[PDB]
Design a protein around this ligand. Structure first.
Ligand code: BCL
Ligand code: BCL
Ligand code: BCL
Ligand code: BCL
Ligand SMILES: CC[C@H]1c2cc3[nH]c4c(c3C)C(=O)[C@H](C(=O)OC)c4c3nc(cc4[nH]c(cc(n2)[C@@H]1C)c(C(C)=O)c4C)[C@@H](C)[C@@H]3CCC(=O)OC/C=C(/C)CCC[C@@H](C)CCC[C@@H](C)CCCC(C)C
Ligand SMILES: CC[C@H]1c2cc3[nH]c4c(c3C)C(=O)[C@H](C(=O)OC)c4c3nc(cc4[nH]c(cc(n2)[C@@H]1C)c(C(C)=O)c4C)[C@@H](C)[C@@H]3CCC(=O)OC/C=C(\C)CCC[C@H](C)CCC[C@H](C)CCCC(C)C
Ligand SMILES: COC1=C(OC)C(=O)C(C/C=C(\C)CC/C=C(\C)CC/C=C(\C)CC/C=C(\C)CC/C=C(\C)CC/C=C(\C)CC/C=C(\C)CC/C=C(\C)CC/C=C(\C)CCC=C(C)C)=C(C)C1=O
Ligand SMILES: COC1=C(OC)C(=O)C(C/C=C(\C)CC/C=C(\C)CC/C=C(\C)CC/C=C(\C)CC/C=C(\C)CC/C=C(\C)CC/C=C(\C)CC/C=C(\C)CC/C=C(\C)CCC=C(C)C)=C(C)C1=O
Ligand SMILES: COC(C)(C)C/C=C/C(C)=C/C=C/C(C)=C/C=C/C(C)=C\C=C\C=C(C)\C=C\C=C(/C)CC/C=C(\C)CCC=C(C)C
Ligand SMILES: CCCCCCCCCCCC[N+](C)(C)[O-]
Ligand SMILES: CCCCCCCCCCCC[N+](C)(C)[O-]
Ligand SMILES: CCCCCCCCCCCC[N+](C)(C)[O-]
Ligand SMILES: CCCCCCCCCCCC[N+](C)(C)[O-]
Ligand SMILES: [Fe+2]
Lengths: 281, 299, 246
């Protein structure tokens, strides 16, 4: 089934691999070579997870957990039930995520639009890979990666965090958090502004962009503008994930102690380091 | 060209905006133009509207800030070098538990915190009234005021509603960079790990989800700016190929899509649910549930 | 347990919100159709929302959604297979017929007005006070197509007044006439403006505007649709990145 204005868009072309072989749809979904590659990776990966559940002895979604290889194994392979299944599943996940992005690219081409979406999605893939591939490699072992379990991965966040005390003190973590908050703040503001203009007080004509500019200008003395707000939203959310990947990639590789101690460099600056008083004197 | 930054900036005379039912007397004059901002968005700063409510809000807001600062200078012994080196370590703490919900705590042991909080209370609420009235004067919907309420709800729960239900100001958050971080960690430790708090998990879902959706929406709009997609209100009133292509990218990708107007409803709720569920998770902590792990065990 | 009742309730609420949100996003494009244009059997589990009416500014009418699909112009495409789910090939020239990446919508054939009732978009020559404030001014630069041939020159910038932003570049062709090029489809460089979506020979084909001082929504769409369609349909004439660096 198609949207009442869709047919004119379902034309051939745009694929990156396989010419017209996979150039078709299944219901609303577009396929393409990467559409099948995704199905392949997702199917196999889900199958290997189910098998890991079998070996684990549970079908409970709240209990199923696939762990990476113990520190012993370092960066080598490992028996299926002891880290190997996690290694293959990770590959299937990476392959499925990358295929989903490449599939989004064929979709962009068929529709003649920009490539911003798959580009932005790549930041997410890069954050995932940072935890499962990049940091584990710099640290020398797949064991440092997180487990695939609903609650177990939270345990991993907790333990990893306290391994350095209160993780809040990670300076890169602070910046990331700021972007996440600022982002949700901007998202709420954007939706409300547009909506407030499209749905003015009952009985009134739709408001216009000028009204949007006037509302915010009257409110905070500034209006970023329609193009700018979409540029900001993408900026904030991409910067948050980037500083996330950054705050972890440096943890355990170039910084090993309690993060709170890192701040001492500023406190120990020679010109005020020994002045009695305050909190640190 | 990815349209992240403008290739060329264009500028016309200062824009004074719409009048509608706004009292122009309370509107200042245009500010300076920033070429810097102009690369990313609008270069125009101002004008701003400042009626009585606005003056009230700004005054209280400053008194809040200044109160915290004067105490910081005190904690620094009035020494400039100490103020800057320990700036993140200073903290204005609320009254000790011994004082319950009373306003009898000595200035240096809670009173200053309460005074600062009173100013913050007034600042935020009068600013909320302001988000409602500025929209009313322009005949717009009150969506901004409602969304803002959701954030106010988490704020209120943290320093007013929960402390009161708990019986003492000592439960509130201290005014300090690091101290409010220690408070946050301690809060989780004291309530048996907040990861087991269902509402904390949802709140995270919406926080991650807000970055998910804004990255999605921002990238989408930019991807179709080649057809004037940013003119969203214009696309709502008279759908164009920008709105159609945007919708089809997502329909073909994940099997379903939105509309130019509907996507902003998805967005305001995605964001608003962050603090909405968050406020609920914190309010229940220590009043109904002492330990989330334990509570999780019976659910 | 109060917390248990709260979480229980939230999920009910959430399921209801999603339901509400999904239906609101069905004010355009529905009912769904089979490829032949007839109502598809499966419309999904969400019913169409109750209609709402938008009162357009400056009395330009009303908009009630959902309502009968507004697209009724001829679509130059033909089925490529008997089964559903397959491409539809252009019967003629997709660029001229306006299909595929070159599709456009029949928007109101009137220029968009700002909140003060004036045309939202104006040539800079006619926008009192507007000037280039930063960056390389493209006016005067020769415009190059993907075939690496000059297709014309920049004679002005069309500005969005309220947003104070450049929306289009007005380009004069060899014959002396001009076309509007979408700003986010051009690359301004030191010695010229480069257009990747079109080869010089395709500029003349860019839809034209009736009045040389304004542009309507319908024209915008035809111009924007045509220029983008070039990315796919002009690819045969698009020189490689190598010949370009030459
Ligand atoms: C429940 C969550 C905790 C909390 C946990 C954290 C964590 C964790 C971090 C911050 C950080 C910050 N917090 Mg805090 N913060 C809380 C409540 C507050 C309140 C309040 C209710 O009034 C304020 C004004 C702040 C303000 C701040 C900023 C100084 C800083 C950047 C956030 C941001 O994106 O701002 C956007 C502002 C505008 C768009 C304007 N927090 C509550 C008590 N906050 C970050 C930082 O760097 O701290 C040092 C950080 O990492
Ligand atoms: C006690 C625990 C510690 C702590 C320990 C840690 C640790 C340890 C980590 C963080 C990380 C983060 N912390 Mg912390 N953190 C603490 C307290 C906080 C507080 C707070 C208010 O107190 C905040 C706001 C944060 C915030 C954050 C975020 C900035 C960051 C996670 C986002 C991210 O990286 O996404 C990245 C985005 C992704 C990973 C998404 C990948 C998605 C993939 C590509 C697609 C999935 C497709 C899917 C499978 C298909 C589903 C099926 C379909 C739906 C059908 N922390 C406390 C002090 N924190 C993490 C970080 O920086 O990570 C890099 C991290 O590792
Ligand atoms: C750096 C950040 C940490 C981390 C820290 C946390 C914390 C802290 C929390 C979660 C929570 C969640 N995490 Mg996590 N999480 C990490 C990496 C991941 C990855 C991944 C491939 O990288 C995935 C798929 C998830 C998925 C999830 C969701 C199950 C859950 C809430 C949804 C949400 O916020 O959606 C944002 C995205 C959307 C709203 C889009 C829809 C996505 C759907 C919901 C995801 C389906 C996940 C699915 C169950 C996995 C099975 C896939 C099948 C096998 C194919 N996390 C990394 C390691 N995560 C929350 C929770 O309640 O956990 C129990 C929570 O509190
Ligand atoms: C060790 C610490 C604990 C923990 C303890 C807490 C506590 C305690 C809380 C959270 C809360 C949150 N946690 Mg946690 N959290 C942990 C780990 C995590 C992780 C992770 C490991 O990945 C993540 C992703 C999160 C994520 C989150 C967010 C979903 C949520 C905060 C939303 C927010 O900032 O609103 C920010 C919005 C506001 C604070 C609104 C109020 C703003 C007011 C209205 C504006 C004042 C402006 C003022 C006047 C100053 C003006 C500034 C000038 C203009 C510049 N937590 C660990 C396990 N977390 C909060 C929540 O809701 O929990 C349920 C919370 O209270
Ligand atoms: C700037 C980064 C932000 C971002 C952006 C972003 N995400 C995106 C996009 C963009 C721009 C898309 O275009 C794409 C999308 O299509 O959205 C609807 C997507 C998307 N983001 C998703 C999830 C997601 N994004 C997240 C975060 C973020 N996305 C960031 C905040 C998170 C978290 C944890 O915060 C999650 C859970 C998907 C819904 C969707 C991409 C869908 C996809 O890749 O499907 C491929 C196929 C499958 C069904 C995968 C099967 C995988 C199996 C082989 C293995 C098992 C996975 C295992 C590793 C998980 C372990 C689970 C435990 C941790 C619980
Ligand atoms: C749905 C929840 C999200 C949200 C929404 C939100 N915030 C909002 C709004 C909305 C809808 C407004 O309308 C209001 C606003 O005016 O936006 C610019 C605001 C706002 N959110 C603010 C801050 C803020 N919001 C935050 C978070 C969030 N806001 C959530 C992520 C955070 C954190 C900690 O993450 C902060 C620090 C203020 C900038 C602004 C309300 C301004 C205010 O109350 O001012 C009172 C004080 C003065 C006039 C002066 C103080 C002087 C200073 C020097 C000190
Ligand atoms: C359509 O807008 C916008 C959105 O979408 C809904 C947004 O989400 C966001 C995102 C939100 C944030 C980044 C955080 C919130 C921002 C603020 C609280 C403040 C930001 C303010 C400024 C950059 C500038 C304020 C400028 C002023 C007050 C200058 C005006 C000054 C004068 C002195 C008047 C002149 C003269 C005289 C003689 C006095 C009388 C922004 C910015 C936005 O703009
Ligand atoms: C103006 O433009 C825009 C549109 O068009 C008008 C859009 O639709 C969208 C798309 C956004 C929405 C429809 C809102 C809803 C989306 C979310 C809340 C984000 C999270 C998404 C999901 C949980 C769905 C994931 C589904 C997948 C990966 C497919 C599963 C497939 C199977 C076969 C099983 C955006 C961003 C946009 O900006
Ligand atoms: C003056 O000095 C010079 C340099 C000019 C300036 C220096 C100022 C400085 C350095 C200021 C620094 C300020 C900082 C670091 C502030 C940090 C705040 C942080 C980190 C977090 C805030 C959390 C606060 C919350 C959750 C507050 C909630 C408050 C309320 C809900 C209102 C509570 C109101 C009460 C108790 C009053 C009760 C009375 C009545 C009747 C309403
Ligand atoms: C509120 C966000 C402020 C963003 C300011 C961004 C400044 C970046 C400017 C880059 C412009 C580069 N250049 C030469 C191409 O014009
Ligand atoms: C306590 C906070 C609860 C606030 C919930 C606000 C949600 C914002 C909803 C925006 C839509 C508003 N409405 C009624 C005009 O349609
Ligand atoms: C607008 C989209 C709303 C749905 C967001 C998806 C949330 C999934 C949350 C999983 C959290 C589960 N829980 C109970 C364990 O916290
Ligand atoms: C995180 C929750 C977001 C997902 C909300 C689910 C929306 C499903 C909409 C089904 C629409 C199906 N279709 C093709 C018939 O339109
Ligand atoms: Fe938008």
């Amino acid at each position: 089934a198609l949207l009442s204005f869709e047919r004119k868009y379902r034309v051939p072309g745009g694929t990156l691999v396989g010419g017209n072989l996979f150039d078709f749809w299944v219901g609303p979904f577009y396929v393409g070579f990467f559409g099948v590659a995704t199905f392949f990776f997702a199917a196999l990966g889900i199958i290997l997870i189910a098998w890991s559940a079998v070996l684990q002895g549970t079908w409970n979604p709240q209990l199923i957990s696939v762990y990476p290889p113990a520190l012993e194994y370092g960066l080598g392979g490992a028996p299926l039930a002891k880290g190997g299944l996690w290694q293959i599943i990770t590959i299937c996940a990476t392959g499925a995520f990358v295929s989903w992005a490449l599939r989004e690219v064929e979709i962009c081409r068929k529709l003649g639009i920009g490539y911003h979406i798959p580009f932005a999605f790549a930041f997410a893939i890069l954050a995932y890979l940072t935890l499962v591939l990049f940091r584990p490699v710099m640290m020398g072992a797949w064991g440092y990666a997180f487990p695939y379990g609903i609650w177990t991965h939270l345990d991993w966040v907790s333990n990893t965090g306290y391994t350095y005390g209160n993780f809040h003190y990670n300076p890169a973590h602070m910046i990331a958090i700021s972007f996440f908050f600022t982002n949700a703040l901007a998202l709420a503001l954007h939706g409300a502004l547009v909506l407030s203009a499209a749905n003015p007080e009952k009985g009134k004509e739709m408001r216009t962009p000028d009204h949007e500019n006037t509302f915010f200008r009257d409110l905070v003395g500034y209006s970023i503008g329609t193009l700018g707000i979409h540029r900001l939203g993408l900026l904030l959310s991409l910067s948050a994930v980037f500083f996330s990947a950054l705050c972890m990639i440096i943890t355990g590789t170039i910084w090993f102690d309690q993060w709170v101690d890192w701040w001492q460099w500023w406190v120990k600056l020679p010109w005020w380091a020994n002045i009695p008083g305050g909190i640190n004197g | 060209y990815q349209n992240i930054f403008s290739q060329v900036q264009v500028r016309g005379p200062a824009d004074l905006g719409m009048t509608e039912d706004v009292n122009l007397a309370n509107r200042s004059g245009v500010g300076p133009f920033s070429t810097l901002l102009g690369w990313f968005g609008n270069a125009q700063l101002g004008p701003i509207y400042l009626g009585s409510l606005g003056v009230l809000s700004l005054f209280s807001g400053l008194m809040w800030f200044f109160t915290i600062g004067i105490w910081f200078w005190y904690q620094a012994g009035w020494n400039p070098a100490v103020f800057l080196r320990d700036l993140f370590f200073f903290s204005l703490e609320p009254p000790a538990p011994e004082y319950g919900l009373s306003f009898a705590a000595p200035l240096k042991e809670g009173g200053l915190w309460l005074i600062a909080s009173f100013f913050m209370f007034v600042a935020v609420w009068s600013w909320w009234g302001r988000t409602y009235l500025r929209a009313q004067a322009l005949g717009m919907g009150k969506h901004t005021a409602w969304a803002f309420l959701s954030a106010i709800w988490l704020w209120m729960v943290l320093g007013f509603i929960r402390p009161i239900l708990m019986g003492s100001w000592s439960e509130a958050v201290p005014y300090g960079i690091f101290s409010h971080l220690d408070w946050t960690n301690n809060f989780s430790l004291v309530h048996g790990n907040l990861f087991y708090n269902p509402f904390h998990g949802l709140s995270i879902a919406f926080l991650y989800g807000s970055a998910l959706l804004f990255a999605m929406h921002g990238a989408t709009i930019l991807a179709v700016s080649r057809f004037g997609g940013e003119c969203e209100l214009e696309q709502i009133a008279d759908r164009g190929t920008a709105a159609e292509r945007a919708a089809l990218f997502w329909r073909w990708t994940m099997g379903f899509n939105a509309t130019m107007e509907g996507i902003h409803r998805w967005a305001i709720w995605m964001a608003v649910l962050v603090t909405l569920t968050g406020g609920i998770g914190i309010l229940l902590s220590g009043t109904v549930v002492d330990n989330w792990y334990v509570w999780g065990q019976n659910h | 347990d109060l917390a248990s009742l709260a979480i229980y309730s939230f999920w009910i609420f959430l399921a209801g919100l999603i339901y509400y949100l999904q239906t609101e996003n069905m004010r355009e494009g529905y009912p769904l159709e089979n490829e032949d244009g007839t109502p598809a059997a499966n419309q999904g589990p969400f019913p169409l929302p109750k209609p709402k009416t938008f009162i357009l500014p400056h009395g330009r009418g009303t908009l009630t959604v959902p309502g009968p699909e507004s697209e009724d112009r001829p679509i130059a495409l033909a089925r490529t297979a008997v089964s559903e789910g397959f491409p539809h090939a252009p019967t003629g020239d997709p660029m001229k017929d306006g299909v595929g990446p070159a599709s456009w919508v029949a928007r109101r054939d009137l220029p968009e007005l700002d909140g003060h009732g004036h045309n939202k978009i104006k040539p800079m020559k006619a926008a009192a006070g507007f000037h280039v404030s930063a960056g390389k001014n493209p006016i005067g630069l020769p415009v190059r197509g993907c075939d690496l041939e000059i297709a014309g020159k920049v004679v002005d910038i069309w500005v969005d007044i309220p947003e104070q932003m450049a929306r289009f570049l007005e380009v004069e062709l060899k014959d002396g006439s001009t076309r509007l090029l979408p700003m986010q489809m051009v690359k301004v460089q030191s010695n010229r403006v480069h257009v990747n979506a079109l080869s010089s020979d395709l500029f003349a084909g860019i839809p034209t505007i009736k009045s040389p001082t304004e542009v309507t929504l319908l024209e915008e769409d035809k111009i924007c649709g045509y220029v983008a369609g070039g990315l796919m349909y002009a690819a045969p004439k698009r020189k490689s990145v190598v010949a370009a660096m030459l």
